[PDB]
Design a protein around this ligand. Sequence first.
Ligand SMILES: Nc1ncnc2c1ncn2[C@@H]1O[C@H](COP(=O)(O)OP(=O)(O)OP(O)(O)=S)[C@@H](O)[C@H]1O
Ligand SMILES: Nc1ncnc2c1ncn2[C@@H]1O[C@H](COP(=O)(O)OP(=O)(O)OP(O)(O)=S)[C@@H](O)[C@H]1O
Ligand SMILES: Nc1ncnc2c1ncn2[C@@H]1O[C@H](COP(=O)(O)OP(=O)(O)OP(O)(O)=S)[C@@H](O)[C@H]1O
Lengths: 117, 52, 425, 436, 422
Amino acid sequence: NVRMMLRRSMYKLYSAADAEEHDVSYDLSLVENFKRLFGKDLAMVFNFKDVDSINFNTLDNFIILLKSAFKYDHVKISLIFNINTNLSNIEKNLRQSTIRLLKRNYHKLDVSSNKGF
Amino acid sequence: PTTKIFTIIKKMLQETGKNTLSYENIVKTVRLRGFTMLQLSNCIQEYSYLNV
Amino acid sequence: SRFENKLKTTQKHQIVETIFSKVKKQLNSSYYLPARENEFASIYLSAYSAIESDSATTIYVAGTPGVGKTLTVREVVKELLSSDFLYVEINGLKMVKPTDCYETLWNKVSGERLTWAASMESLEFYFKRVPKTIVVLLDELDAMVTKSQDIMYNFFNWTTYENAKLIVIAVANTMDLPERQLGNKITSRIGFTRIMFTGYTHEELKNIIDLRLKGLNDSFFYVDTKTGNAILVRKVRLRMSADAIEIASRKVASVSGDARRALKVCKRAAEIAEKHYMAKHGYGYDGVQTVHITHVMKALNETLNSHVITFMTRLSFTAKLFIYALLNLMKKNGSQEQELGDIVDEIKLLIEVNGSNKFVMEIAKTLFQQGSDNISEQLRIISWDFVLNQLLDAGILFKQTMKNDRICCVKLNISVEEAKRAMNE
Amino acid sequence: DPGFGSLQRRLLQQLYGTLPTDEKIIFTYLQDCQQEIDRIIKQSIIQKESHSVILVGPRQSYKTYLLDYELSLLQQSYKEQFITIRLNGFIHSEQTAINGIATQLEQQLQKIHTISSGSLTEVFEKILLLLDSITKITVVFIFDEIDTFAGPVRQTLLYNLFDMVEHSRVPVCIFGCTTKLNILEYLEKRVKSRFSQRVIYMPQIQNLDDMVDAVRNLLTVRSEISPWVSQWNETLEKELSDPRSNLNRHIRMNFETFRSLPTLKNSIIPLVATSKNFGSLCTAIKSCSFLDIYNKNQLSNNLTGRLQSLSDLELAILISAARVALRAKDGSFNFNLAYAEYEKMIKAINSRITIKLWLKKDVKNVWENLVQLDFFTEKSAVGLRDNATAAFYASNYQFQGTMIPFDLRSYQMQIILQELRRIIPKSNMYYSWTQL
Amino acid sequence: NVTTPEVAFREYQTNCLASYISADPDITPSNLILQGYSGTGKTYTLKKYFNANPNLHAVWLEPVELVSWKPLLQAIARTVQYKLKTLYPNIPTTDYDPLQVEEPFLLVKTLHNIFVQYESLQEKTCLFLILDGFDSLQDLDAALFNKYIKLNELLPKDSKINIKFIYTMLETSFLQRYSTHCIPTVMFPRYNVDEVSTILVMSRCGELMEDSCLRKRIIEEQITDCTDDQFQNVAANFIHLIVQAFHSYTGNDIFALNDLIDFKWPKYVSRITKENIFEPLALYKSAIKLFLSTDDNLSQTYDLSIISKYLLIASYICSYLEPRYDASIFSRKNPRYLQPSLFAIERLLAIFQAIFPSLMKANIEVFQNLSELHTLKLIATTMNKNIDYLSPKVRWKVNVPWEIIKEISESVHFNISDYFSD
Ligand SMILES: Nc1ncnc2c1ncn2[C@@H]1O[C@H](COP(=O)(O)OP(=O)(O)OP(O)(O)=S)[C@@H](O)[C@H]1O
Ligand SMILES: Nc1ncnc2c1ncn2[C@@H]1O[C@H](COP(=O)(O)OP(=O)(O)OP(O)(O)=S)[C@@H](O)[C@H]1O
Ligand SMILES: Nc1ncnc2c1ncn2[C@@H]1O[C@H](COP(=O)(O)OP(=O)(O)OP(O)(O)=S)[C@@H](O)[C@H]1O
């Protein structure tokens, strides 16, 4: 859903945040107060493992939720789209209003075990 | 025109309290008033829905 | 217990005890019984044997609500305090979760509070180990049967132990309850006593009224003419016409045979004469009186008569415009359930099939724009979401949920003939 | 002048009814209904009656406005004499409402001069023993949407309070407010026998003259505050006495469609605050042209102004979208069926004459706004669930329509083809395509 | 009485929001609806009011950065005691736990606990709560919106501080469910083609004359001392043309114009000359190539192998080929538009063995590429994605459109258009 994709992901960074830090709520409340909750700033990265099996409207509604975090200026977001193939399939599935959100600084790096042998 | 006529029946029900099916002495107090024999004939059948 | 000391306050500024106030004090539903006289013994002689012999039995009574089965078994145990037991009112509907009754029993043996799991362990440990006395009322048994019958098997398996100091008394809604909800393995444990309670009869319904009207029927009050206060300047009396009390009985015994319904229709009819007496003289709130037959004629009808007919003729125009379109489709198709877009299709069509009558034109001007020839050309009519929402929460209409606002079906909820009939006005 | 602005202070709080409780004004078409409510409520506290009632009437019908009016009418003279407990059926479920009662009980005790502590059924038998049991405190219950408590499954909370009528020495009174009309059949047998059966229906504006009489009592100020007042009062009725006056004309429209006063009461609030001097306000109620602009704005984007505010292509896609929709029996149509017939429509325009026919990869960006402008719907899509746990059962359900691609989600129609001809003007070139 | 601001195209709507909002609570109506679609600046025109009114106090909440109502109650109760700390710092406080609340009773339980210590204030002060985006909450239903309407009346009405609401939502089908509550609504209309361009020019002059991509191109070309007005003209000539060559593609949006500008702007900058600064019409004629293409799409020859390629080409056959016809026309002796039908297993290998160049019999690698194609989501299960292996009742289906099939047919030299016959 939109819900547990948020909630598990906030949980997964939070234990990663306490382990480097040496009660709270698992949503975007931590994201703004991360400057005060943990001192230093935040640069998270999103290893979307198998991206074409997900219902894309959930993914499209997910990225609009991340769009609201762009007004705090102490956090940096980075998305990694590990597709299997077929980039043209992916620009078909999403909402076109979010592709224009995506198309700011895209980089189509190829990673293939078989690349020119 | 029918709210009063239940109470003259209640004046009989004051007297003996009888729920008889066919009438010869209930109708006797009706003809001196001004209503016909047909209006009370409907009043027999419709007050059967009141189970009285 | 504790806070009833705090529920008392001091300043009580001389409330006017009028004529009909002292009626409603005894017409309160609180304070030997005439109707279920011998069946009180049939419970009690079934109960007196097991009590004075240290056994474990079961007693099953049924009947419609309003017949005294809440009352009678309280009168059983009440005299028994004069002559070894712990009384508990284990109500079914007063338990939030069905397992919560288990907590009460283990609370009401020593005073401990554990879970429903840990209670019934020690309850079972009680019911087969104690050397040798517990009365328990399992009221309103429709509540505690619902989930998987695992609770109900326990409450009768405890009865089977010969070393179980317990006396259970079940009071249900129907005699059918261990035959259409329970299993046969419970139905062996329920026994075959099965004391049936019928309704009340209309003769006894007279005999229950005057028990409340014992010291007050045709008695005398002492009244000052200035405030309307009555004391058990004139010395007035108040009489109750017994024939009107009789016609109260011959209806309530006919339909329901309910002891609350008989008292309350007398209680409702009592206050009709209260306001009419206050209307004629105005004593506020700071020769021979009676209660007519015409009071209980209204108040009994006041249980029956509706207003949805009067509600419909007092609705808006577009409300009555809506239903008249809706019956037109139901006699066009005969399918009693029409698509929402077809109704919007019809109310368009029901404009121009009528002529160029200027009333319809003054309607048709207003029906698509609130005057204001600037803004016009509305597709669906003005406030069409509003009246359809107003007909929905009123309960007259019913509309299934769909995000399409065209093919969502609509179903009537009241009888369509009375909808046809109220439309005629 | 501030005296004109002081008149704005008086007139506004008169339109909200936020006056002190001596001068709150009840309209004439319901004065009888509050008095029988008053005869119920004041003999419940003073004369210690223990009887219940159900208020029934449609939404926005002063029902919650009537009851606290009585309380404020009794708060002035009977201060400590009673406490009120108010429960909404909306805000309270079946089980937290027990905690709703007990917590609202104890805060009254400090106002009148260990309860909420324990389990939910532990505090439940507590308030059972505290209620069932110089003078006694009486308790007034205020229930909003009591029909939702009257569900099918348990109905516990109704069964306890109605038995508190029968046995408790503490004098209570219950006030059910709802809008489901036949409330009595919604109850089962064993609860209705506890019920004292007395319901009271709420009145409606039965004649055109009634709300005309209401709005006169609504707008007229009787207390002397401003020098403008005597001038202001006769301007009001002079508009109201004339049946050909525009304010009297537009009130007739409100009697027709809505027949509900707070709808019209809503309209006047900007109309009397938009004026800046005294004379402009009198012209405003003389002209009532602002009501036209107001009813314009309330209408401006439900369905028609949605259609007027689209470009040339967005019309042309949707116009093609209905001409496909007329062909099939259910009316459903895919995206490929749309763009195919959209192609030959543009080809017909050039061959009968210079119009940029767009590609495939771009119509999707226009197709995105059209579905979220609700001009189309998905074929089998229940839009909004009624309550929370029915919506939560729809969230876990993985769907099949997303698993077929974007261009094959079988979109159906919200606005039918024949109705497009009536709204689209003939000056537009696609007017020949509205009709088939 | 209030100090209204002034904006571009909300001249009616600034008046009503100045009408329906006062610092006095009695004149202030309880609940309010600001309605309009995205692309009207309602979050713009609301805050633009609030900056012009420092007398009132606003607490700004954001539902779209939340996910559910259970944190949304925790969102409210954390903020009011956060705000009232910063409004009356002399008032002592038993600070409560905002984590504690999770149920709609608990809010009014805690607001009964919050406001009572603030009773000693001097005048009835209001306090405006603002919810932004109430329709796009991702767990909404029917019985949530009314649940927040009656929250005011469960509060004690005689407290010195009164909480009132303003609701921002969209999708006006949703508002038609609640018109019978008759709460005062201020609808926000959509825009017209001029006022889109009129809004856009006064909002994008502040960046597109100050971008370094201009400022590089200033000093890179022979810079004549062109004025900021000369920079203003070419910026205005850019905006007045970009909305003209794209309005049919975008509708009356503002967000979808705010980014297409920021894609085509530096590509417009490179095609200017020193001389075309005075020559705007010929400048468009030299920079023409971007104004007729979208440039939002950042057709693959697919990666999969040869036997998997014929595995795809047999799966597309049962979008039209029914079992009544296929075994006759494929002997060893139109729904191109329509949605695809449902497979079963071994009907693939029925068609696969026929159309392959006795030359093949081993089917281990053929079974390999099936669940390879299942991970590519090009052929998916009808049911849930779990038990599809063991042959219970499982139906299969393609999810690839016709064109990618058509290229992949010729990519393996196989002819497919013969066997599709209406
Ligand atoms: N024979 C009677 N004599 C005197 N009072 C009676 C008699 N029968 C009923 N009542 C009164 O009427 C009330 C009706 O309650 P009951 O009939 O005892 O309850 P009920 O029959 O179990 O209906 P329930 O509890 O909903 S199943 C009693 O509480 C008494 O106050
Ligand atoms: N605090 C208040 N003071 C005075 N009038 C109020 C107040 N709150 C609401 N109203 C009025 O209440 C009327 C709406 O009717 P209500 O009874 O509040 O709603 P209802 O639909 O009749 O019943 P509810 O509220 O839906 S359960 C409007 O005329 C409001 O002006
Ligand atoms: N009158 C105006 N003057 C200047 N800029 C305006 C005006 N109206 C709208 N805008 C701009 O329009 C932009 C749109 O902002 P938003 O409020 O997000 O639009 P929206 O319709 O509210 O969509 P949302 O955010 O989903 S509610 C604002 O950021 C402003 O820059």
